[PDB]
Amino acid sequence: TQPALLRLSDHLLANYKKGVRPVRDWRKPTTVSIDVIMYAILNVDEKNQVLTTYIWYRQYWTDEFLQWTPEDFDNVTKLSIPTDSIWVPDILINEFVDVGKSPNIPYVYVHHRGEVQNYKPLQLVTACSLDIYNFPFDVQNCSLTFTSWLHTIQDINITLWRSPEEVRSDKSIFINQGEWELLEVFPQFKEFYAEMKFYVIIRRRPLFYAVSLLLPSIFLMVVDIVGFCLPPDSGERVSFKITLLLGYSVFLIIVSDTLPAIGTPLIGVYFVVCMALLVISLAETIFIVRLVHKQDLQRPVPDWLRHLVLDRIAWILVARDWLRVGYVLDRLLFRIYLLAVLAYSITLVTLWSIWHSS
Amino acid sequence: ALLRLSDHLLANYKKGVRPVRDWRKPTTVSIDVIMYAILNVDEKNQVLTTYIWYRQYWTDEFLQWTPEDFDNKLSIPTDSIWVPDILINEFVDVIPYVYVHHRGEVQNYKPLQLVTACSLDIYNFPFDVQNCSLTFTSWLHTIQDINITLWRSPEEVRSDKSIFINQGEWELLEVFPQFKEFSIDISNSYAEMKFYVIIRRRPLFYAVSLLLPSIFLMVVDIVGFCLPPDSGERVSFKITLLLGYSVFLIIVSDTLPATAIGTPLIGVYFVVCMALLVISLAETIFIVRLVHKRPVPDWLRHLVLDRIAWILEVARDWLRVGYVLDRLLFRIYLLAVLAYSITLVTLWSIWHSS
Amino acid sequence: ALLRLSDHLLANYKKGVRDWVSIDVIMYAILNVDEKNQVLTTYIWYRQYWEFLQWTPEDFDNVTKLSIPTDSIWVPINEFVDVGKSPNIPYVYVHHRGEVQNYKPLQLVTACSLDIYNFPFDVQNCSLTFTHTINITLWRSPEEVRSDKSIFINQGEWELLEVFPQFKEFSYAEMKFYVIIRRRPLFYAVSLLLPSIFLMVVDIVGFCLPPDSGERVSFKITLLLGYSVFLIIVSDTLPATAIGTPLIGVYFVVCMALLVISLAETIFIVRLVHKQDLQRPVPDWLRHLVLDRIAWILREVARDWLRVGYVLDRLLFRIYLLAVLAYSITLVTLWSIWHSS
Amino acid sequence: LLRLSDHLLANYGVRPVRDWRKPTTVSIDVIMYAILNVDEKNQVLTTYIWYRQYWTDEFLQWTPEDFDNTKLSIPTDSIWVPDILINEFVDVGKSPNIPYVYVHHRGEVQNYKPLQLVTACSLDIYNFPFDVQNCSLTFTSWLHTIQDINITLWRSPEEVRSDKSIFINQGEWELLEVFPQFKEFSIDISNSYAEMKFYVIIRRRPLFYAVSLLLPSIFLMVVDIVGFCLPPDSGERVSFKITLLLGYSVFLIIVSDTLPATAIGTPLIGVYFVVCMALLVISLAETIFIVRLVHQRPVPDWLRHLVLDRIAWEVARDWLRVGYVLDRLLFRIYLLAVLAYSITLVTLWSIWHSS
Ligand SMILES: NCCc1c[nH]c2ccc(O)cc12
Ligand SMILES: NCCc1c[nH]c2ccc(O)cc12
């Protein structure tokens, strides 16, 4: 009389007992098969040490009660029932801090022989070890673990639905754009209490910061290099250097609010060095120009400085003596700046090597 | 007797069953989306935030009654009778009642603000044209269970912008739905409705803030040759130009969007013009330094002689070398500016014709 | 006696009973506001006051004031859009003779009409409304609501000048509350007005510079870059990506247009001066035009072209001074209209 | 424990114990974790707080004899809570939700919960970047007078003043002291209300700003000072001052974008940037005007008299002297402004450090 589907739903649910595990054989365990497909690394934070991701999470299992003969209920071999009305595995992430406002899937699929499936999108916010040095060419070994929250391995067992190799492959649903590129999802079974571990290794894309940090820094260093060719005994160089210092300060302000942060081998070369070298060069230029132009001859060049400078010139090689000492100091500063820029380029190439590519 | 009608509804239904008489007959979910606003299009994250007025309706076979028996449509509160499993397949981040009709039909309306995952290509910045999508699909049920169909005709939905709030940075061109059949097996086919929303960028602000200063900087840089002589007054001109350009590009790099694919096509010419300007400043400094106050190698003199021949006391030889190098630099400057103008015209033509 | 009283009043009163209210509102702080989305977000204290409970203290251990949970207990915004993350205060307050209280703060998210025309000297008039068929009233007289502003957090972007109520007729006897929030323009004294004034002054200085020199062209182009970066920067301060088009947004484009025109003039003139070869001389009609113009505001062909360029430059300078004076006059006018009212 | 909970809930919101005969009491402890963000524009201080409170109930009391051996966990929603709220509050924020409360067999209920408290506060930006801000968050009850619900401290005030170990101590702002102060709020409804005032003293780290704003500002000032070593006439300095001014404008736009924007007053340094702005513009105008003339004192009454009297405390003969005296006057003004900037910086740092 009643519709076949309605009668099936009644027969199954009105009797269904919310047992600890839906198994008639109470002693033996029941297997829960898991599968995780990554979709996007929405955000990664190094301050909060969290990793916001979107993963399509599907857990399979079989129930002893939710089985019926298709002979009755009009040859029906497939059914859908509300999630919370039945028992679902008590599987939780060992690491999650919060879960975002993912859509609420209310249905849990069932099959006539007792099989159950529960798909659900899952926007985790999990806390992991973030180590940002080698930026912008970073590689993160992020991972997360699934486990039975209260039950032990003797109650419910966790295993893959697909072979480990298939899970490891870079599945095609992922959004391969933007900062973070997914290398692999490497699963590992640890079986404490069943414990299933996925190793999500994500590699940053350095070209993302080609304009933000690479091009501006390279250009500022090159501009300072060409500026060093200007004579040191004129206000031309002073104006050039001070405007370049303003450029460096504006660059620092601009990146400080964008650069994910104290210390980073890219940023230990930028501003601890080039800003300090620029400031020292500007200070010495100001002092030399002021002293030479005032021409008061308040003091001659002291002997100790004379000997020290005539010794140091070998490394690179009365107002006129002051001009000469200023010039040789300027050449020494130019040599040091050349060394700094060479070290920067070497470091960038070395980092691009560890960030194996091409 | 609407309370009695509600009690009659509550007496039998349980939300776990598909409202259909024959389980073999798939439920048909009528769908329609109206684009209201495009809050943001984040190029770095590749997320198209947007606001959509989402409306759907499906038949409910068991929910039929005679209106006169209850004093003659009804609304039901939260914990509604049933709802399909339609999901926006590109969702990555984000009304409590439904309407019913006496003839066995249900209605649902929703203001839904989305954070959708899109494929953004910023090559043509600032004149971008995006082709973002929206894939509504049955997350769990198959084709045998739920089928999605457009409420309104595809022509009606393609051109419908009266609700769209034109104010913003982006412009709406279309919302073009097309039905597909996703198959994970011979059976178990899923029905998915794809609304390909197309949008453009409004380039006025970027034309006036990015393209105008860049074009004028290139033009005045070219002018640096003409009146300023080959030595002397040109050094300070180039110095000021370079110092202004450095800060301008610091800010531009702060402003231009970047993606894994790479920089916008326009962003290549800023770097080219910087290289040219730095080279010009260096060579002008060199000429000024040498002419005033070296071996002047003969092979270099022959090289420059061959170059000029193919283009179309020692200080004078230095001056001739400087003149030839300046002519070469002017030729390259003109070529670069012509290329920049041609690319701007091409990008604008593509953006407009779209 | 507390639990016995609770059970007694629970059994005595039903939710469905109203034969089948006084409101006091205090403003605390104004949250996000902007032209976009036309929403006013604020934090507000809402005190509510308005028989079955009516019980005698003597029969209940002389108890006089018993709190009750709000779960399934009956209690009495038109501009409503959202209520925000306000606390979920669960209890309610009752008195012995039936008097009931209910206090709870709200982070109201209400849609309102805002003008940006007078930005940043902007004074806005927004009103919240309270609104079963016909009654709602106020705890105090309308004039008393004004003094409540003294508790407002007044150091934010907006002042709160006055909160003034009114009564209407259930078309809930719609109660009106009119609140006047006056923008504080000293946020933008450094963000917006100071760079504008400085760029105008610097551009003024860069006009007595010789009109045929290289330094003139370098100065003008560097100022153009400065204007462009200023436009890029403040474009995030104002809600609109382009120029927001307040009355002051006009003067952010007039100056740039004049600077561009002056730059084009200067480059054209230097280009002509560089060409010492014979060239189209200044035709008689342009000579007459420039003669008439200069007469009303006050190496040969090259000299005449240079003079034409000079007079055109002085025309540009005159119009630019006029524009700057207009900008200053409008600024003082807006300050007067904002301060007076 | 299951049977204990069943019985406790079966025999069990309401006010716990005999208020008319004996007031109740709630104790609260505040642990400061991190100052996520302090907003100088909106005047809202965002902080992460670990909040603990306990109060003595009467219904949930039992003995180990009743159920085999002292502590139990019960759902948060079902049982009555002390109704404590922070008045200096704007938004809840995002923080973990805790489902279960703790209860001790003797009758003590313990509640732990961290909350991302977004508070409205009075920020004094005048001192920026050497900024010390006394920000207070207060706990009080409104539907319950002092008789209905008192409030007290979990531990001694000296401890909570000292306890800052859990603080991350990373970011822009430090944390100096979290010291409470109990006050009895008197209101018309009832002659006493109980409120717990917690004062939070934070402090900015000026290293980033010292090397981003102050260093280039001081260097621009000094470079301008040495600019006067160039001759007052001639175009060598005209190019110098032009380059300086063009750099200063682009620097200043970004600086203005950077500084905090409180209404009461812009930073005490923001005045000196404007002062040097004006001085540089005046110097540029002076040098351009001087070079314009030299390459004849028409109004001696205004021009000659002032220059003649100034030093007391044919273009070369007339104008060049005026140009030189103007240059020296402007140099003296520049020196005074730079000295004032230096003294203000030293004073601000002294105030910040002595805090
Ligand atoms: N989410 C698992 C089932 C499903 C529904 N729609 C899909 C689209 C693509 C895909 O790989 C899978 C699916
Ligand atoms: N009658 C309610 C008084 C009240 C509630 N919250 C408050 C906060 C502060 C204050 O002074 C007073 C109050």
Residue numbers in the entry:
A (entry chain A): 8 to 199, 207 to 275, 278 to 333, 422 to 462
B (entry chain B): 11 to 82, 85 to 106, 112 to 310, 315 to 333, 421 to 462
C (entry chain C): 11 to 28, 32 to 33, 39 to 68, 71 to 96, 100 to 154, 158 to 160, 164 to 200, 207 to 333, ...
D (entry chain D): 12 to 23, 26 to 82, 84 to 309, 314 to 331, 421 to 462
Question: How do the authors describe this structure?
Answer:
We demonstrate that the pentameric ligand-gated serotonin 5-HT3A receptor (5-HT3AR) can assemble to tetrameric forms and report the structures of the tetramers in plasma membranes of cell-derived microvesicles and in membrane memetics using cryo-electron microscopy and tomography. We purified the full-length murine 5-HT3AR in a saposin lipoprotein-stabilized lipid bilayer and performed single particle cryo-EM, as we previously reported. Further classification of the tetrameric particles, without the application of symmetry, resulted in two structures: a near-C2-symmetric (which we will refer to as symmetric) and an asymmetric tetramer. The differences in the conformations were observed mostly in the extracellular domain (ECD): in the asymmetric tetramer, the ECD is organized similarly to the pentameric form of the receptor with one missing subunit, while the second conformation assembles as an apparent dimer of dimers. Both conformations showed tightly packed transmembrane domains (TMD) with a C4 symmetry between the membrane leaflets.
Our dataset of 5-HT3AR, recorded in the presence of serotonin and without extracellular calcium, should correspond to a desensitized state of the receptor. Structural analysis revealed densities for serotonin in the ligand binding pockets (LBPs): for the symmetric tetramer two pockets were occupied—between the chains A and B (LBP1) and C and D (LBP3). The distance between the extracellular domains for the other chain pairs B/C and A/D was too wide to form an LBP. In tetramers, the displacement of the C-loop and of the interacting residues were minimal for the LBPs of the asymmetric tetramer and LBP1 of the symmetric tetramer. The serotonin poses were significantly different compared to fully functional pentamers (H and EV1G). In contrast, the ΔiG for LBP1 of the asymmetric tetramer and both LBPs of the symmetric tetramer suggested less efficient binding (G and EV1F–H). The ΔiG P-value calculated for LBP1 of the symmetric tetramer was >0.5 (i.e., 0.59, Fig. EV1F), suggesting a non-specific molecular interaction. No significant conformational changes in the transmembrane domains of the tetrameric forms were observed upon ligand binding. Significant differences between the symmetric and asymmetric tetramer 5-HT-bound forms were identified primarily within the extracellular domain. The transmembrane domain exhibits a consistently stable arrangement across both serotonin-bound tetrameric forms.
